[PDB]
Amino acid sequence: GVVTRFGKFSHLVEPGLNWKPTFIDEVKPVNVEAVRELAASGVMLTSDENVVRVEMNVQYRVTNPEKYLYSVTSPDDSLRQATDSALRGVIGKYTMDRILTEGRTVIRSDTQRELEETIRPYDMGITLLDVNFQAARPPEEVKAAFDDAIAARENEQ
Amino acid sequence: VEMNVQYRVTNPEKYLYSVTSPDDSLRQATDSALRGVIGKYTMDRILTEGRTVIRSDTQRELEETIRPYDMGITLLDVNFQAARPPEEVKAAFDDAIAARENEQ
């Protein structure tokens, strides 16, 4: 709980049964010990003018509500915009072929590190827990040929 | 072409008793300045290179246009917004790029 004076914040109450003078101060609780989720996807552009359908999942948590509540408006939404910029910027550096097989491990690391650097000035109370890359499948328009390329190997054999 | 002009005002003795409808009069003056300057530069330049030298010239030219007037309006910033080509010719502009891809 976050006990707060009419306009001003008063003090942080710990779990249990507390008392607040009715009509004078109000409490606003926040969950700070429970994993959250923020899935960010989009049709990003690679470094070789190729298109790749990448999707990512960002599991995070929050911290002391003084920062989370009074740092930026809509902290969940604002973080999502930062995540998109990081993912596109990161994807923008590597080529399509790399991102599909090799980039899987580094892309999450770079996007996670960039996302943290992007939200350092904000001072928000959001803490990044893990960035687990989900998929980097190619565009559906070219997927047909990508499947044929594998079928061609079997046809060759 | 589309442009945005951010400005402020000053001592009302000029703004109020110099010219009728100063905001509208400034808009008409802006069109004459914008039309004149654009006429000097070519299409290709204005879209990519001319953009920075234009916001400098149009801002400077617009100021010179209102110097004799003596109005109390003060120019704050001249921030160019858009230079998209005519919608009728946009079709061909994209096809030229597609041809390169088709060539490959």
Add this chain to the structure above:
Amino acid sequence: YNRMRAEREAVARRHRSQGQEEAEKLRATADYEVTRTLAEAERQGRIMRGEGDAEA
């Protein structure tokens, strides 16, 4: 607008025409190599036939 539109179309035609020109050239050389390789094999086969005919 038509004047500028016509000029832009020329660039598109130039790029597309250039690609077709290059593609045709590659196909031309490809056919030559196929014929050349096939001709060499046919030449070798004729040699074998003469030896067999000579042996018989």
Add this chain to the structure above:
Amino acid sequence: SQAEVLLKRKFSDRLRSEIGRLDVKDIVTDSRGRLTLEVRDALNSGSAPVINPNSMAALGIEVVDVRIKQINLPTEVSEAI
């Protein structure tokens, strides 16, 4: 509402000017937020202790950061790729 509009107009001009002098390759490979920093630098400090009137410092605004979420492409240009 008024503040967001003003920032948008200035951002457009600075961004358009930069992209005009840059190539598509130079816009997709940028990994250090150079253009965003330059645009942010320009918005924070303009041209002319003097506070440039086209700067966000002349107003009570400070652009803490500038980022591009997703650089998509036209429908026709993407279909040819």
